[PDB]
Enzyme design. Structure first.
Site, PDB file in Angstrom:
ATOM      1  N   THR A 108      12.110  19.850 -52.973  1.00  0.00           N
ATOM      2  CA  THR A 108      11.902  21.237 -52.577  1.00  0.00           C
ATOM      3  C   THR A 108      13.235  21.955 -52.485  1.00  0.00           C
ATOM      4  O   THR A 108      14.170  21.488 -51.789  1.00  0.00           O
ATOM      5  CB  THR A 108      11.170  21.337 -51.236  1.00  0.00           C
ATOM      6  OG1 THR A 108       9.922  20.666 -51.389  1.00  0.00           O
ATOM      7  CG2 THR A 108      10.939  22.788 -50.842  1.00  0.00           C
ATOM      8  N   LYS A 183       5.746  26.225 -53.577  1.00  0.00           N
ATOM      9  CA  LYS A 183       6.075  25.305 -52.501  1.00  0.00           C
ATOM     10  C   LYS A 183       6.685  26.079 -51.255  1.00  0.00           C
ATOM     11  O   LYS A 183       6.329  25.661 -50.139  1.00  0.00           O
ATOM     12  CB  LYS A 183       7.100  24.212 -52.997  1.00  0.00           C
ATOM     13  CG  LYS A 183       7.483  23.200 -51.910  1.00  0.00           C
ATOM     14  CD  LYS A 183       6.315  22.364 -51.357  1.00  0.00           C
ATOM     15  CE  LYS A 183       6.839  21.246 -50.457  1.00  0.00           C
ATOM     16  NZ  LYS A 183       5.783  20.574 -49.681  1.00  0.00           N
ATOM     17  N   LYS A 248      15.785  23.113 -43.922  1.00  0.00           N
ATOM     18  CA  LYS A 248      16.309  23.493 -45.244  1.00  0.00           C
ATOM     19  C   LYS A 248      15.264  24.392 -46.019  1.00  0.00           C
ATOM     20  O   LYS A 248      15.564  25.433 -46.521  1.00  0.00           O
ATOM     21  CB  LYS A 248      16.570  22.181 -46.027  1.00  0.00           C
ATOM     22  CG  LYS A 248      16.940  22.011 -47.470  1.00  0.00           C
ATOM     23  CD  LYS A 248      15.730  21.831 -48.353  1.00  0.00           C
ATOM     24  CE  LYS A 248      15.043  20.412 -48.181  1.00  0.00           C
ATOM     25  NZ  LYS A 248      13.893  20.384 -49.101  1.00  0.00           N
TER      26      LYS A 248
HETATM   27  N1  LIG Z   1       8.406  13.645 -46.650  1.00  0.00           N
HETATM   28  C1  LIG Z   1       7.462  14.580 -46.925  1.00  0.00           C
HETATM   29  O1  LIG Z   1       6.423  14.705 -46.349  1.00  0.00           O
HETATM   30  C2  LIG Z   1       7.705  15.521 -48.097  1.00  0.00           C
HETATM   31  C3  LIG Z   1       6.591  16.139 -48.675  1.00  0.00           C
HETATM   32  C4  LIG Z   1       6.762  16.984 -49.763  1.00  0.00           C
HETATM   33  C5  LIG Z   1       8.041  17.229 -50.276  1.00  0.00           C
HETATM   34  N2  LIG Z   1       9.134  16.658 -49.658  1.00  0.00           N
HETATM   35  C6  LIG Z   1      10.458  16.932 -50.223  1.00  0.00           C
HETATM   36  O2  LIG Z   1      10.794  15.899 -51.120  1.00  0.00           O
HETATM   37  C7  LIG Z   1      12.219  15.690 -51.139  1.00  0.00           C
HETATM   38  C8  LIG Z   1      12.500  14.241 -50.732  1.00  0.00           C
HETATM   39  O3  LIG Z   1      11.926  14.071 -49.418  1.00  0.00           O
HETATM   40  P1  LIG Z   1      11.845  12.612 -48.736  1.00  0.00           P
HETATM   41  O4  LIG Z   1      10.881  12.792 -47.572  1.00  0.00           O
HETATM   42  O5  LIG Z   1      11.600  11.510 -49.735  1.00  0.00           O
HETATM   43  O6  LIG Z   1      13.346  12.545 -48.127  1.00  0.00           O
HETATM   44  P2  LIG Z   1      14.163  11.200 -47.669  1.00  0.00           P
HETATM   45  O7  LIG Z   1      13.162  10.108 -47.191  1.00  0.00           O
HETATM   46  O8  LIG Z   1      15.244  11.756 -46.698  1.00  0.00           O
HETATM   47  O9  LIG Z   1      14.837  10.658 -49.045  1.00  0.00           O
HETATM   48  C9  LIG Z   1      15.855  11.464 -49.615  1.00  0.00           C
HETATM   49  C10 LIG Z   1      16.175  10.722 -50.887  1.00  0.00           C
HETATM   50  O10 LIG Z   1      17.187  11.502 -51.545  1.00  0.00           O
HETATM   51  C11 LIG Z   1      18.314  10.668 -51.808  1.00  0.00           C
HETATM   52  N3  LIG Z   1      19.504  11.550 -51.756  1.00  0.00           N
HETATM   53  C12 LIG Z   1      19.770  12.503 -50.812  1.00  0.00           C
HETATM   54  N4  LIG Z   1      20.902  13.121 -51.099  1.00  0.00           N
HETATM   55  C13 LIG Z   1      21.374  12.552 -52.239  1.00  0.00           C
HETATM   56  C14 LIG Z   1      22.588  12.710 -53.087  1.00  0.00           C
HETATM   57  N5  LIG Z   1      23.495  13.686 -52.811  1.00  0.00           N
HETATM   58  N6  LIG Z   1      22.726  11.923 -54.141  1.00  0.00           N
HETATM   59  C15 LIG Z   1      21.791  11.017 -54.486  1.00  0.00           C
HETATM   60  N7  LIG Z   1      20.679  10.754 -53.786  1.00  0.00           N
HETATM   61  C16 LIG Z   1      20.461  11.496 -52.669  1.00  0.00           C
HETATM   62  C17 LIG Z   1      18.288   9.610 -50.722  1.00  0.00           C
HETATM   63  O11 LIG Z   1      19.157   8.514 -51.064  1.00  0.00           O
HETATM   64  P3  LIG Z   1      19.471   7.334 -49.969  1.00  0.00           P
HETATM   65  O12 LIG Z   1      18.336   6.330 -50.070  1.00  0.00           O
HETATM   66  O13 LIG Z   1      20.798   6.802 -50.428  1.00  0.00           O
HETATM   67  O14 LIG Z   1      19.559   8.061 -48.572  1.00  0.00           O
HETATM   68  C18 LIG Z   1      16.787   9.327 -50.678  1.00  0.00           C
HETATM   69  O15 LIG Z   1      16.438   8.525 -51.829  1.00  0.00           O
HETATM   70  C19 LIG Z   1      12.817  16.696 -50.175  1.00  0.00           C
HETATM   71  O16 LIG Z   1      13.213  17.906 -50.863  1.00  0.00           O
HETATM   72  C20 LIG Z   1      11.649  16.996 -49.241  1.00  0.00           C
HETATM   73  O17 LIG Z   1      11.781  18.291 -48.622  1.00  0.00           O
HETATM   74  C21 LIG Z   1       8.983  15.783 -48.611  1.00  0.00           C
END
Ligand SMILES: NC(=O)c1ccc[n+]([C@@H]2O[C@H](COP(=O)([O-])OP(=O)(O)OC[C@H]3O[C@@H](n4cnc5c(N)ncnc54)[C@H](OP(=O)(O)O)[C@@H]3O)[C@@H](O)[C@H]2O)c1
Length: 293
Positions: A108, A183, A248
């Site tokens: 997102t 979104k 964010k």
């Molecule tokens: N969780 C939800 O319910 C949900 C639902 C819909 C959409 N989203 C969106 O989907 C996206 C991911 O969410 P998530 O819940 O999976 O977040 P998360 O559990 O915090 O995972 C973030 C992922 O991004 C990687 N990452 C972050 N910064 C990075 C960088 N600079 N370089 C390379 N890799 C990086 C992390 O790597 P590491 O493993 O090394 O930390 C991890 O694999 C976000 O934009 C979030 O807003 C989330």
């Protein structure tokens, strides 16, 4: 240089490399593996790639090393700067991709960011869709995500089998940035539905109501309640969806509102609340922990 065969045939033109194995990206990439599309993964923290490597997925050394081996790169990292690093850094996707590769950003951010990524990638001959998702961690795990897509409609159609591996309702919204646009509308609703739930619960607890019956009556029903009320009642504050990520999202919401001259006082309040939560050190808790951390 050309490279050896991987899990997915080259002549498919559907070899996927997945970057960002987080709460969403792990289960999404696993669904792609089960469907036969996943060739490669990259994660900044190598440990999370282990379960993929144990199923024969190629573990890339960088986004560039991933990109040279696939047809489609899916990105599911946290924020727009993280997408910039993985696409455009010193060993980013653009350093390895051949022309005709497609990047799909499923994280997102915003319409403006989507357009910037597409513009920058098109200088390399790389295509782009913005395809963020709704349904939470549970949707990711179940494969039932709603996926909202911007970009060329022809690429939406070409990638529909990939999207259907991860999700159920796949919606084409319009040109680049219209997936992020949808979104961010969705995140207004999610944020305020979550504040709704938390304030309801704070009031119910102050009144000494039977939580079983509170949960029965509220299940007022919404997404936040269905996804997170059971966790919240057990004091499980883990994500789920991290508070810093919603903060964010709400920042991009308010930027777009300001650009368009619309006032969103609820979204402004939500932003303030979640901003405080991050300042207070709870940015990595789930959004349902607001008011309870
Ligand atoms: N969780 C939800 O319910 C949900 C639902 C819909 C959409 N989203 C969106 O989907 C996206 C991911 O969410 P998530 O819940 O999976 O977040 P998360 O559990 O915090 O995972 C973030 C992922 O991004 C990687 N990452 C972050 N910064 C990075 C960088 N600079 N370089 C390379 N890799 C990086 C992390 O790597 P590491 O493993 O090394 O930390 C991890 O694999 C976000 O934009 C979030 O807003 C989330």
């Amino acid at each position: 240089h050309h490279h050896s065969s991987g899990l997915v045939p080259r002549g498919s033109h559907m070899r996927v490399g997945f970057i960002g194995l987080g709460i969403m990206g792990g289960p999404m990439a696993t669904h792609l593996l089960k469907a036969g599309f996943l060739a490669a993964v990259y994660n900044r923290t190598r440990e999370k790639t282990k379960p993929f490597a144990e199923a024969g997925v190629y573990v890339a050394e960088s986004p560039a090393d991933l990109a040279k081996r696939v047809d489609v790169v899916i990105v599911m990292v946290s924020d727009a700067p993280d997408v910039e690093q993985v696409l455009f850094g010193p060993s980013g996707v653009v350093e390895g991709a051949r022309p005709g590769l497609i990047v799909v950003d499923m994280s997102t951010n915003s319409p403006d960011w989507a357009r910037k990524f597409a513009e920058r990638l098109a200088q390399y001959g790389i295509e782009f869709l913005d395809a963020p998702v709704t349904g939470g961690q549970k949707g990711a795990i179940e494969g039932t995500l709603t996926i909202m897509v911007g970009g060329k409609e022809e690429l939406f159609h070409r990638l529909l089998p990939i999207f259907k591996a991860m999700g159920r309702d796949i919606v084409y919204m319009g040109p680049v940035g219209y997936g992020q646009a949808m979104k961010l509308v969705n995140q207004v609703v999610v944020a305020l539905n979550t504040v709704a739930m938390v304030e309801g619960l704070k009031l119910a607890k102050a009144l000494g109501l039977d939580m079983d019956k509170v949960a029965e009556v509220l299940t007022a029903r919404s997404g936040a309640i269905e996804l997170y009320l059971p966790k919240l009642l057990k004091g499980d504050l883990s994500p789920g969806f991290k508070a810093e990520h919603l903060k964010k999202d709400l920042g991009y919401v308010l930027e777009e509102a300001r650009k368009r001259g619309v006032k969103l006082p609820g979204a402004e309040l939500a932003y303030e609340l979640y901003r405080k939560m991050v300042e207070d050190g709870a940015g990595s808790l789930g959004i349902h922990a607001l008011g309870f951390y």
